[PDB]
Design a protein around this ligand. Structure first.
Ligand SMILES: c1ccc(-c2ccncc2)cc1
Ligand SMILES: c1ccc(-c2ccncc2)cc1
Ligand SMILES: [Zn+2]
Length: 140
């Protein structure tokens, strides 16, 4: 579980979006496992605008923050799960690290802010859905 709160926006894993997220839908992309809903409250989070390939992510299954190196956002083959068929996921960054299902929504950050959220795991890898291209999260 987890969300990014920036301005009047909530960023969640599309596959973990609640009924209220869909009732307040701003934008979603199945290929990215992302959904953005609108919030009454002002969010704190700054979105990184950078090409950092190092950062720290929260792993809820270990209650720990891990430093990681991660690949640039890419089209990545992701095995079938409960939520999606075996498919290519866009805007995904892979690192060596621990990720179990309930780790999704864990934040990855660099010195510049939030880079993305845990979206995938297994085989000793963690996948992060990048949000750094979503410039519109910073206005309106
Ligand atoms: C690096 C540092 C803090 C965080 C964080 C901790 C707890 N809740 C949200 C973000 C994520 C990555
Ligand atoms: C919190 C989380 C990551 C970082 C970091 C990530 C990438 N490059 C430099 C620092 C600093 C503070
Ligand atoms: Zn950065």
């Amino acid at each position: 579980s987890g969300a990014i709160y920036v301005g009047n926006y909530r960023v969640v894993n599309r596959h973990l979006a609640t009924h209220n997220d869909w009732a307040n839908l701003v934008w979603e992309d199945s290929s990215r496992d992302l959904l953005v809903s609108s919030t009454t409250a002002q969010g704190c989070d700054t979105i990184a605008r950078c090409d950092c390939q190092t950062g720290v992510y929260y792993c809820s299954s270990r209650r720990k923050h891990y430093p990681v190196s991660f690949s640039k956002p890419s089209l990545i083959f992701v095995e079938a799960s409960e939520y999606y068929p075996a498919r290519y996921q866009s805007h995904l960054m892979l690192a060596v690290g621990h990720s179990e299902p309930g780790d999704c929504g864990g934040i990855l950050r660099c010195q510049h802010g939030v880079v993305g959220i845990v979206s995938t795991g297994g085989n000793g890898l963690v996948g992060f859905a990048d949000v750094r291209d979503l410039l519109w999260l910073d206005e309106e």
